[model samples]
Target: SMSYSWTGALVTPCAAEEQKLPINALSNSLLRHHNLVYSTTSRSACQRQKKVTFDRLQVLDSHYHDVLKEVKAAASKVKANLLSVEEACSLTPPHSAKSKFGYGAKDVRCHARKAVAHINSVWKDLLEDSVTPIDTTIMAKNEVFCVQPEKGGRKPARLIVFPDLGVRVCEKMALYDVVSKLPLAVMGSSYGFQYSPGQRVEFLVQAWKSKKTPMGFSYDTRCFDSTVTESDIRTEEAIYQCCDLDPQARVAIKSLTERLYVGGPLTNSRGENCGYRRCRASGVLTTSCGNTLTCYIKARAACRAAGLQDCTMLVCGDDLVVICESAGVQEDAASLRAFTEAMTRYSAPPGDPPQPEYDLELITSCSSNVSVAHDGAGKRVYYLTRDPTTPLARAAWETARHTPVNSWLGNIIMFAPTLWARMILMTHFFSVLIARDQLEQALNCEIYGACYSIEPLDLPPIIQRLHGLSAFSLHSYSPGEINRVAACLRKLGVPPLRAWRHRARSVRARLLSRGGRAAICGKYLFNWAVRTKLKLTPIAAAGRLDLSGWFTAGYSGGDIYH
Candidate 1:
């Protein structure tokens, strides 16, 4: 099926090394040795082990390997050529999107517009992705979960509601990647990310905004102009004017009087006095003084031009309050609507994609801190999805005994960000690096909104154990191998370097609570649980085993004991 092709913008962040392996390595090892993971053919009675745990583990491993293969293919397409700002700016178009690429200029502009829209629509998805309910049993499909009512006559709880910050963060991360890559491709305003010509053909960067910064508010159009060096836009004047009140009408018309003179007669909503045939051609009140309250001056001109009463305003401090006949108010409203309508014609907000339809429970079942909810309006909302399961608590992992291979690395460039120009460049590079036709063919594969799950117990322990091993200089597992998997998984979420750092800090915080068990227990417990859950007994060949020899003495005198 055809998918949204990424072919616009140009600002490639420096191509980075694979931060993590995209697949489970130990599973790969097992598959190589046993060659059983790929056997889709029905297994005979001889293959059915009495330890159903072992059977489940084998099946889980095979499925995991399959997913890994797909994810890997998705990953290898990443271009590794990290570019400096100057290099990016030197190559990207500086004026218009048309100049970004010598050819495909139209295609580049169209894609740029579409990509921006796609990124924005995901915000609604982020909001609607999850919802909450109290007293829950979040069972996966084809599985069952038991639930119990709260004891001691406790009230049934309502679901905790919050934003899907994860989805927001993920969207931001993807956007950042795409934006950082744009300066090397499209040429328009450098509102957020851009190429520059300060010293040489150099990339110019405004200070990066964190997630806290509200969109549109953080932007300064002047940042892109290398010729000027102002940080913020300077405001000229408030120019507020309010008129005095009128005594005859027993209302505030006198307060609405102002000094700005009218240029023409004010008209009614029926255009009774509006002289011109069209709204634009119709003259409005203009100030005789040419003072700086432009909006007021235009409003006055509009009132006069419509041939309404020459109502004026009396300034109260800086506020401008105008008073006139009912016809004046009606005319002003019509003019106001007309301009706004014109704006809508030329500058409508971008259209958004249809929101994806998946349940909050489905999305958050894999996470711990997140919650989802829905308002009465039928909008999906925030509630919690905690990983309170035994497997996650135990850090159990499964191992497959068959190889998994991926084929998507070519098209998405691993979904890395690049300018329209850089995308072309990387595509050229990808064509040479891999079989071009093969990669292109895979690009035609179906695009699906992805989801995931996690066993918390499996993670905390490995994180703890792997993290702790660094301090003691002992190894229960290969740190590099562990990290490779962690990095790959981390990237899969489209999380940021900062979020990972934040998670690391969380782990460290747990590590610091005087009792080390809270810190280390989760790690070891998780590893044990994952091993059990996956039914992966340590691979032992006489003396050597899968777990860095920790199993040789049966989890004794190794890093875990220390």
Candidate 2:
């Protein structure tokens, strides 16, 4: 996923003992503060116990329904009336990946004539040409990881193409809202992001058992997007057709599907011609949107055929978890094998053989493990977690560039109550961002194309939604994790944890004196040490977990990130 800025390091953060300088420094800081030190203890016990909780399968709010209505209406309008070449090219973000034509991303305006001309030609070819599966350009995505590795330990390079800037415009016009809302609409609560960490834990724990033996486990497809066949693209187009699109809009969508979605020629980074692609490309506007719909469509159908009872799907792209009732212990095992056969027939062979789990807590999806640990007060708390390798790597990146998303902020949003996120990630990044004077800046961080205005005060509600009553509690960091975090701060040339404590005291004091939102933020986010903490008041609409209205479009002063 061309999602994060790629720094081209393969070693998992803090996993390798031999890492040098800032990387090691960052790793050690994380370990020390949060006791995030790597665990030699087997996760088997944690996975077997029921420890997480949340409301199962949410009912969509009126806002979500309204958004769907608006999206379809807008999609219909775009189908009838498409954007012009010039107009579409202008909407392209300045930071879009550069082209091989000697024009960098920033050169779009400087080479407007050439860029627009090329875009028009591609648009013309797309509209005039008959429906043919397009080819894609494959280039190694230097960042992003998955459960498995391709050649050389890197995930498969993204398959993409340089579509006419007009086509890019066409995509946003016809599919932007469709892609954004369709998954939530069609999949409903099964959409992964709809559930908070606690809610997911709840569902897994409860769904782990049923009237009969339960079958539960995550499904893995080898190179999922690449496995998307031409038929899959046609099926996706068929979904758009159901929108009752106008003739012009219908034609535009068909053209866009052929010219962009179905695949294109593969090209290396140096512009050398590779080969053609016949599968879904990863670096396009619709990659995630397309993959989610297709995978769900296939998996749902396969599960039904295999006779799984009460089958519930939580899908995030290709990552899937199927929680369903099984006939018996033996039958449950047989059902899993049958599911594998059914999925294989559907063209998504399991990379890791599918196994049945009667334990909900045992299942791992989206790389998060639900486990229990003791907090500072000696009370046990459960958390949804993944190793902090990605977060650490991203934190290191934040030390340099103005990142698209704040790793610490995002972690706090998703895993706010987790020991690592609160004690280590929140503490470290806030200290770093403050030292660099970037805290108040509304840095953009996107989840499913929905961007949030990330500020300190904004967290109270997000934290409340995920952890509820526990948001105010203090969780002790693991000893192993603390050592690593301490080592990391020293290597990254940042202030010590004690320095962060001092900074927090000063920052908290000033904010409290200021009152209002600043004071509230200080109390919720930094009150890990307060003897008597402020009571949390619910923020209006903050608990709406659905994506609608969660983001502000375009960047501005309120959206600024230093």
Candidate 3:
């Protein structure tokens, strides 16, 4: 069956789309090679359609079933809650799309009469009918990036397929607890979303050190969303059945699995039949969980079939990194070769074939890796970091367009410990905020698909808690990461890191002049900016921060934010 079967109605955009990066006063300050930045709109979606439309053939074996049994057994130990309608409603984002059924996100959030009545009706209908197919809207996503010549100029738009708002809220009611609790419970440390950047680095480094010359590789799983089979989605449902769920919840799960998860009709924004999806919907509630569970089962079985040893698998959705003891380069390479073959048999072949990496830093999963640097104590520290190119480009785009979600804020939070993020990103964003007189205003950004209205004033404490006090005082970064950042700057037309350092010195002074938390930010975040800096210390405000959903799960799709 086809992942996408179309009726020939073109994907239409709601408004005019910008192909090149729109320049703002701050955009040029952050990105100089303006032409390097581009966005994907409906114009390129046809190419994207070509890439995602394909049929799959899978052959499962004893090893695959063995891992599946383990997954189900692990899941059996947990109980999942079904959220109340009110609880699920509260999780909807403010700007969520209005439903075709006479309700909007605001209506759902406020518990308006119409939205609540429809939501109740939807739930009752779910219990009464278990096999009717649901409908979804397919829209082209407009995302920013710095052009890579090999990637073939401006990339095509990725499509987001989502159900009506009422059904979306109902999904949360049925499975929010299961999605929240299942991954960590079943996979333990192997569940990648359970760790913060600092903890993730620790997991990777410790796992590598535990090996005798550890070798690792990141599996690309070529378009994992479209790779999903009906059996794969149903297998995920079987895993959900392993949990101790209420009877009502159980019925809802099965109904949803048949109605929405298995496959659905795809409608365009103009209400025309755009296509039909036989594979996974990118914006459904199960997108992350299904991908994670299926990938783990396939890759784990692949590991067994390939005869790899001491395997420590880190899985965040379809982005996977496997670290295991090396037998020898020749032997490890051969083992990885077989692993790819095994994965292909499982219907999850790599976009790029996996090759065993000797160096830990060279292997990046979930777009980040463990890089070495020295802390304030002059001890070698391992931390998570990524290639700065994409984040920097997106930061420039968000600066120009002012999307509700600020890309720069998320980068600063996740990469606060890195030299590139701290010096260049902090300096650039802070300069803009203060200059625009929005220093005290809270900006929204998503981590794990949960919205955070993070004020600039809170960065010092937030950075301290997530990365540690060393985030502020760390220096003497390894050349591997520094060179990557420098090379990235060159590619993206970003001003040299040196110029960013000079700007931070001024940005630092303005922050301190305001005193209080701003002073705290200036003191710690910009310590490296000054020739002689204030002695960094613990932040009292950071002592009690609760970051519950900040790092628990990956929600790349799912039409989610709360």
Candidate 4:
């Protein structure tokens, strides 16, 4: 039975904030350099923690369950429509992964026939011989540093490899739609990003099934994709076999798996042969889909072995959250020991020793923390957030070139109610959009396996689903956060937030004056400071999901076709 209605506060017996320094040590640099001068700071350092601690509340009420049923039913009924060679080639982006062959990404149309023929030849080759695994071209991937503050530099580049363009086309034809739909169908609410920070707390708390604190913690797998053994790849293949496919397609899939999926020889930049990989590689068409299924399978079985009752989970890739009935105080430590042993035996050992938390709200995934703060109107607002490193990095990129997806846009959609996002991200991006005459353009972003061409106006419906009507009213900012953002803008050479707000006024006026999609962009995206706001209009692709659904599910690749 659901203990709480949807209308009120989601947390019951919420844990008070614990005092600590900021989780990301870089946050202090702004203060040290005098870039950010805080007018006042939090009386206690409790707000500095990366994890938000609170009693979990059950949020998967009757409505949530119904939505889950609908999503599964929708997924089950999905039929894969394999794209023709021409069609598959057409789907390749102009800026997609470069091929080692003479053809270039920009030369797609000119080499369309050759590309298609090459793919078909590979398909035929695979069908003829399905015994050996395919080889991949490995490239080193450099990414941002997120872990240690003292380290403060880019991570050592990791090796990743995908098949050639022709093979990639074959993979897409056979498994694109299948992989796209499978995770949502199989995992349902277990898709971690499906719930807000507040709703997550609610679900874990209610799912705990104990009046006392529950033993819950999120598990992080080390080198999760790299750790997938050859047997695991075989298991993925068997699972794919269960899907309905043409006989020839099945043969192609099996051949592709043997050659590319299981293990492959790596090629280095110097054109020298590196060693062979017996485990999964990160850069591949099936990486996300394969990881989700493999991790879920291992975790589900391991939880059962650990004797955890009615364990609820939320999984994305290898990130796993296990919320189960807690052992009594006398048995809690012993139960955790058993769980650790079971998980370790399944090839999932803790990055650090996993701490079993009494408050489910403390669990962090995707580096985001959920916390409650007051909106401009003094109404309590719950939001998901992380350190500003990635956002700032992306913001700098946005200023230079047109990104396929705006990280700022994605976050604002997911965390619209957050004061930082509303005041900082929304203002900055829209200002950039207007400055560059991009408000009328549809820039695409990937969410939940689908691509969407996001218009500035789409914010209303996106916000409505993710954060509800309260999002429109959230206007306040954390004093310290505001100062930090100001410092970042100066350091990064982006316009100040106030300048963004000033620019938005003109953009809004021009948009409202012009009408049509422009008006929509201005009216809704800039509604916070407007005297009269308009109601959100129905976005056809987004309307399929009810309020309870996780996200607006629609795929447009890059361009908005529909």
Candidate of highest TM-score: 3
Give lDDT: candidate 1, residue 205: 13
Model 2 off-target regions past 4 Å?
Answer: 1-94, 99-125, 131-137, 144-165, 193-213, 369-384, 400-405, 449-453, 461-470, 474-518, 538-547, 551-562
Give TM-scores for every candidate, taking all chains together and pairing residue i with residue i.
Answer: 0.16, 0.70, 0.98, 0.72
Q: By summed lDDT, which 10 consecutive residues of candidate 3 come out lowest?
A: 553-562
Candidate 3 per-residue C-alpha lDDT over 1-562 given as tens digits, one digit per residue, 9 for 90 to 100: 7888889888888778898998787888898898988888988878888899998998999999999999999999989999999999988888788989998999998999999999999999899999999998888999888888887666789998888899999999999889888988888899998888898998999899998789999999988999999999999999999999999999999999999999999888788998899999888888888888888999999999999998999999988999999999899999999999999999988887788899988988789988988976789988889999889999888878868778789889999989899989999988988888999998888886667678888999999889888888888998888899989988877888789889999999999999999998889989998988788888999987777678888776765665
Residue-level lDDT tens digits of model 4 in 459-547: 66666655665666655555554565566555544555666567567767877787765676566667775656666555443465454
TM-score of 4: 0.72
Worst 10 residues of 4 by lDDT: 1-10
Which of the predicted structures, 1 or 2, would earn the higher lDDT when compared with the native?
Answer: 2
Better of 1 and 2 by TM-score: 2
How many steric clashes does model 2 contain? 33
lDDT at position 185, candidate 3: 85
| Candidate 1 TM-score, true structure as reference | 0.16
Rank order (by TM-score, best first): 3, 4, 2, 1
Write the residue-wise lDDT of candidate 2 on 1-562 in tens digits.
1111112222122122211123344434433332221211111212211111111121323433353444344334332234444444544555455554445444554546666566556556666774664443333323322121233332322323345334454565455545545566666667675566777776666566444666687889765765677667766776666554556566767877876676555444444545455566666666666777677776776676677888888887778898887678788777778777766666667767988876554677887756665655688666676665556555554554444555556666777766556655676666565556665666656443344556665667667665775665646645544555565555334456566666566666666766776666677777774556666556564665453443212111111111
The lDDT of each candidate is 0.21, 0.56, 0.89, 0.57
- Displacement of residue 27 (Cα, Å) in model 4 is 18
